[PDB]
Paper text:
The key enzyme is the O-acetyltransferase CsaC (MynC) encoded in region A of the CPS gene cluster. Our structural analysis of CsaC identified the capsule O-acetyltransferase of NmA as an α/β-fold enzyme with Ser-His-Asp triad. Each protomer consists of a central eight-stranded β-sheet that is sandwiched by six α-helices and capped by a lid area formed by helices α5, α6, and α7. A deep positively charged groove, which traverses the protein surface, allows substrate binding and opens into an active site that is characterized by a catalytic triad composed of S114, H228 and D198.
As soaking of CsaC-WT crystals with acetyl-CoA or CoA yielded only incomplete substrate density and co-crystallization trials were unsuccessful, we soaked crystals of the catalytically impaired variant H228A with acetyl-CoA. All protomers showed complete density for CoA with a free SH-group. Concomitantly, the triad serine showed an extended electron density with a contour indicative of its O-acetylated form (AcS114). This suggests that CsaC adopted the double displacement mechanism of ABH esterases and forms a transient acetyl-enzyme intermediate that is trapped in the absence of H228. CoA, as the first reaction product, is bound along the positively charged groove in an L-shaped conformation. The pantetheine moiety is engaged in hydrophobic contacts (I233, A39, and F40), and only the distal carbonyl oxygen is specifically recognized by S113-Oγ, a contact that directs the SH-group towards the triad serine S114. The purine nucleobase of CoA is sandwiched between I11 and K48 and locked into position by a hydrogen bond between adenine-N7 and Y49-N, while the phosphate oxygens of the ADP-3′-phosphate moiety are encased by a hydrogen network provided by R237, K53, Y51 and I52. In the H228A(-AcS114)-CoA complex, Q138 positions AcS114, which is approached on the opposite side by the SH-group of CoA. CsaC-H228A, in contrast, showed no detectable adduct hydrolysis, demonstrating an essential function of H228 in the second half-reaction, i.e., transfer of the acetyl group from AcS114 to the acceptor (CPS or water). In support of our hypothesis that Q138 can substitute H228 as a general base in the first half-reaction, Q138 is optimally positioned in both CsaC-WT and the CsaC-H228A(-AcS114)-CoA complex and impaired acetyl-adduct formation was seen upon simultaneous replacement of H228 and Q138.
Residue numbers in the entry:
A (entry chain B), B (entry chain A), C (entry chain A), D (entry chain B): 1 to 245
Write the structure that this text describes.
C-alpha cells in the first residue's frame, strides 16, 4: 500500500516514499505526468529531488526520483545503475511510474539536468518513454564519476582486480549501449540543451549525437547561454517549461 | 497507467494486465489482499491463475500472478526465477502488490500449491510478507523441474557445459537460500499443508522445516488427506479459507 | 569438394576457402608445408593472412588461416578458441592441414606473431606439430584480450555473472593448459623470438618457458632487436626464413 | 598428408585411415560420391564398414566411416555423438568428405542401415547433404542403446547422477532435434525403407515422420519384405542400388 512505503520525510509538503531502495515523491494530478531525476549533489550533501518548484502550482501528476542509496560512505548515487550493474533500479522506477501515473507515455515527460539527464535517458531509452527533455548529460559515465568520487567509482568497479577495468568500460558505455539497443521505430521526442560554455558536456553531446545518428534517431539540441552553472540551469528550466506548455 | 497495461484478456470477472513480462489479474476490494501464484501446468496446457473462484464472492482485494513467459518452447514458467537466476521477476511482483494493494502487509495473504507455493515462499521470504499459506512446495527445485521438462531446466541452466553443475545447485537451493537469508525477527505466519500420502513432498517439507528450524522460524504444518492429487488440493482450499477467516 | 569451398576472394596469387567457419588460403607446392596464423588486427581492420609474401617465391605448400568470425560486433577473432571455449576450431584447422598437405609432419612449419603465435602453439601442442616458430605470443590470454576489446572477452566469457570469473581463468590459462597436457616425448622444435625491448611479452615468454621447463620440453628462444613493433617483426621474418632453410 | 593417416588395416584392398579418432576407408573415383556409415555390431565384434561390396565394381568415389572408438571396454560406437555429447565427430566426418570428395553435395549419397542410418541422417541434417538413403533408423537413440549395452549407455550418461537423466533425454532426442533445426529450404532427397515385420522400427519411423511433417519436409518411405533381419537388408541394398543408378 503506497502510504505504508512512506519514509517520514516531507519535501515542500510532498511525502517521500521508498520502494525497493528507490526513493520518490508523488503527487496525483491530471493531463500530464512530469518525472524528474536527481542530479549529482556536492560532496557530503544529501541527494535532492530537482525541479519541484517548477511544477508546484501545476495541476499535472508529478513524480521525482532519487538515485541509489549506495555506497553508504558516499551515498550520492550510482547513476541509476545497480550494484549488480544492471537495470534493477530502472525497472523499479518504471513499475512505480506505470502503476501510479494516470496518463499514457506520450503525455509523460522525463526531466533532469546532469546525472539526472542521464537517468532520464536510461529510463526513457529502456522502457520507451518518448518525451525526454534534459540538459548537459554525461556520455562517458565512469570517466565523469572518477572526477567526483573515488569511493563511488571503486564501489561500482567491484572488489576483483581482474574485472575492474571491464566493469569500468561497461559503466562508461552504459548509456551509449542504451542508445544502441533502443527501439528506433518509436517516435522519440528527445530534447538536449547545453550551455554554450560547457565545453566538457558539448563534447559529451557530440558523442551522444553520433550514437543516435548511427541508430537513425533524430533529436533536437539547443545551445543556451551559460556554462556548467546555474545560468545554463536557468535557461534549461525555461526551455522545458515552454515545451511542456 | 494501469489501464494501458491491459492485455485484452479477461479471466472470469477480472481483467488481465502485463508489466515487465509479469502477467497478473487484479480486482480492488477491501479488508484483505489475497495473492495467488500459478502452479506448474501439465504439458501443453497454458499457465493458469489459481484459486480465483475461492474469492469471487469475497470482496477482498485480489491479485493472481503467472510465472515467467520463457522458454518459449515450454513456456510454463521458471519457478519465478529470472533467466539470470535472480530476483528480477519477484521484484516486479513486489512493486505491483505494494502499489496496488490497499491493505497492510499483515492483512495480505500469499497462496499457492506446488510451484505456486514456491513462488509464495520466494516472494514472502524476500520481501517480508508474513502470511504464507501453501500446499506441498518443492524444496530442491532443479531435482523437481528436471522430472517435468528438460527444456526449462536446460534454459535456466545456461549454455556453458562447465557451469551446468554450478547453476544446478544454485537453482536447486534457490528457495533454501531465501530461508537461510530471511529476517528471523518477522512475526512469520507460515502454513504449509501436504497430503498424508504425498511421500515426495512430505520429504520436501522436512527439508524446508529443517531450514526454518535453524533460523528459529516456527511454521504451522498440517497433514491433509490425499497425496499429490486433487483431494489434497480440496483440503488445502478448505484450510486456507478457514485460516483467512 | 575443395573447389566448392571457395569464397570467391583471391588474396595475391591464392584463392580463399571456407570450411566450417574456418577461412584459409591454400596453394600446393613441394618439399615443405608452411602454415601461418592471423595475428590480432588493429581496431576496425579486417583479419589478414600473415607472411604470404615470404613464401610466394618458395614453391612450398602454403596454407594461411584466419581466426573465428565471431563476435560479429568486433570480428577480429577469439584466439582460435570456439565460443564454447573448446578445440572445435583448432580441430577443423587440423583436418584441413592433414588432408591437404603433401608432406610429413616434420616437414611442416607453424608460423605466427602475437595472437598468430598463440594459434600456432595451440594447434601444434594439441595435435603434435613439432616445428613451431613464432614471435612474442601472449601467455595469459584473457589479461591481454581485455586490453584490446572488451566485446570479444565478454563474448568468450558468456552471459552468466557467476561464471565470468571461472571462464576468465579458463581462457587466461587455455594456452598454459595445452603445455601442461602436451606430449613430452615429441621431438619438439619450438622457436620463440621476442623483441629485446618488448618487456610485456618478454615476461609472457618466461611464463611460457616455465611451463615448458617443467614438462621437460627444451625450446629455443632468441631476443631480437625492437619491442612490440615492426622492427621485431622484420627480425622475426628473417629468423624463420633462416631456420626453414 | 592422407597417407600418413593410415592405420595399417586393409579391407578388401582399401587402406584404412584415421583422423581425430575417426576411422574411414577412401577410394577416389568419378561422377558420384558414395558414403556409408557403420551399424551396431554384435557384442565383442569389431565395428565394420558396411556396403563396400555393393560398390567394389563401381567407378564412384567411395568413403566408409566407423563410429567413435569409446567406451574402450565396449568400443562399438556412441552413435556418432562425442563423449562431450556434441557434433565433434560429425564435424570431422564432414571435413574429411568435403576435402577428399571430387563431387558436389547433390552427387553425394549417404547410406546406412541401422545405427548407420542414424549416422547418415545426423551428418546429412547437420551439414546439408541432400541425398540420404537409409533403412530402419532408430529414433529414440538412448532407449535403443539401453537394450544393447549398459557399458556404452553409462559411459555416455556420464559420472554425475544429477545429469544422467538429463544426458539420457538429450541423447534420446539427439536425432529429433537435428530434424527440428535443419534447413527446411533445402531440396532434401531422404528415402527411408523398413521391413514390414520390423514393428519396433516402424514405430521409430512414425516418430521421425512426425518431426519431418512439423518441419514441412517431404520424405519418401517404402515398406520392404523382411523384418529386422537380412531379408530387409537385402531389399534395402537393391533399393539404394537402383536409386543411385
Ligand atoms: C538548480 C537547483 C539548485 C534549483 O533549485 P530550486 O530553484 O530551489 O528548485 P527545486 O525544484 O530543485 O527545489 C529544491 C527544494 O526542495 C529541497 N529539497 C530537494 N530535495 C530534498 C530532499 N531529499 N530533502 C529535503 N529537501 C529537499 C531543496 O533543498 C530545495 O529547498 P530549499 O528551498 O530549502 O532550498 C536544483 O534544481 C539543482 O541543483 N539541479 C541540478 C543542477 C545540475 O544539474 N548539476 C550540478 C552538479 S554537476
Ligand atoms: C484446482 C484447479 C485444478 C482448478 O480448480 P477450480 O475449481 O477451477 O478454481 P480456480 O479458481 O483455480 O479456476 C481457474 C479459472 O480461471 C480460468 N483461467 C485461469 N487462467 C486462465 C488464462 N490464462 N486464460 C483463460 N482462462 C484462465 C480457468 O480457465 C478457470 O476458469 P473455468 O474453469 O471456469 O473455465 C486449479 O486451481 C489448479 O490448477 N491448481 C493447481 C494445484 C497444483 O498443485 N497443480 C500442480 C500439480 S503437480
Ligand atoms: C608484417 C605485416 C604488417 C605486413 O607485412 P607484408 O609485407 O604486407 O607481408 P604479408 O605477406 O603479411 O602481406 C599480406 C598481404 O595479403 C593481403 N591480405 C591479407 N589478408 C587479406 C584479406 N582477408 N583480404 C584481402 N587481402 C588480404 C594483404 O592486403 C596484403 O596484401 P598487399 O599489402 O600487397 O595489398 C603483416 O604480416 C602483419 O600484419 N603481421 C602481424 C605482426 C603482429 O604481431 N601484429 C599484431 C601486433 S599486436
Ligand atoms: C548385411 C551385411 C552383413 C552384409 O555383409 P556383406 O554382404 O559381406 O557386404 P559388405 O559390403 O558390408 O562387406 C563386409 C566385408 O568387409 C569386411 N569388413 C568390414 N569392415 C571390416 C573391418 N573394420 N575390418 C576388417 N574387415 C571388415 C567384412 O567382414 C566383410 O568381409 P567378409 O567377406 O570376410 O565377411 C553388412 O552390410 C551388415 O551387417 N550391415 C548392417 C546390418 C544392420 O543394419 N543391423 C544389424 C544390427 S541391429
Amino acid at each position: 500500500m503506497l502510504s505504508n512505503l512512506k519514509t517520514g520525510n516531507n519535501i515542500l509538503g510532498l511525502p517521500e516514499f521508498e520502494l525497493n531502495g528507490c526513493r520518490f515523491l508523488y503527487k496525483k494530478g491530471i493531463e500530464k505526468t512530469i518525472i524528474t531525476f536527481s542530479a549529482f549533489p556536492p560532496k557530503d550533501i544529501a541527494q535532492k529531488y530537482n525541479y519541484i518548484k517548477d511544477f508546484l502550482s501545476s495541476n499535472y501528476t508529478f513524480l521525482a526520483f532519487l538515485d541509489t542509496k549506495y555506497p553508504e560512505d558516499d551515498a550520492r548515487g550510482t547513476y541509476y545503475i545497480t550494484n549488480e550493474l544492471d537495470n534493477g533500479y530502472l525497472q523499479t522506477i518504471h513499475c512505480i511510474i506505470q502503476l501510479l501515473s494516470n496518463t499514457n507515455q506520450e503525455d509523460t515527460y522525463l526531466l533532469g539536468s546532469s546525472k539526472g539527464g542521464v537517468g532520464a535517458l536510461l529510463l526513457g531509452l529502456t522502457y520507451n518513454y518518448p518525451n525526454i527533455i534534459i540538459n548537459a548529460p554525461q556520455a562517458k559515465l565512469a570517466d565523469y564519476i572518477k572526477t567526483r568520487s573515488k569511493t563511488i567509482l571503486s564501489y561500482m568497479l567491484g572488489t576483483s582486480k581482474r574485472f575492474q577495468d571491464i566493469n569500468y568500460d561497461y559503466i562508461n558505455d552504459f548509456l551509449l549501449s542504451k542508445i544502441k539497443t533502443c527501439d528506433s521505430s518509436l517516435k522519440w521526442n528527445i530534447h538536449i540543451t547545453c550551455g554554450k560554455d560547457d565545453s566538457y558536456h558539448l563534447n559529451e553531446l557530440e558523442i551522444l549525437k553520433n550514437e543516435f545518428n548511427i541508430k537513425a534517431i533524430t533529436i533536437k539540441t539547443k545551445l543556451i547561454s551559460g556554462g556548467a552553472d546555474n545560468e545554463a540551469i536557468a535557461h534549461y528550466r525555461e526551455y522545458f517549461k515552454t515545451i511542456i506548455q
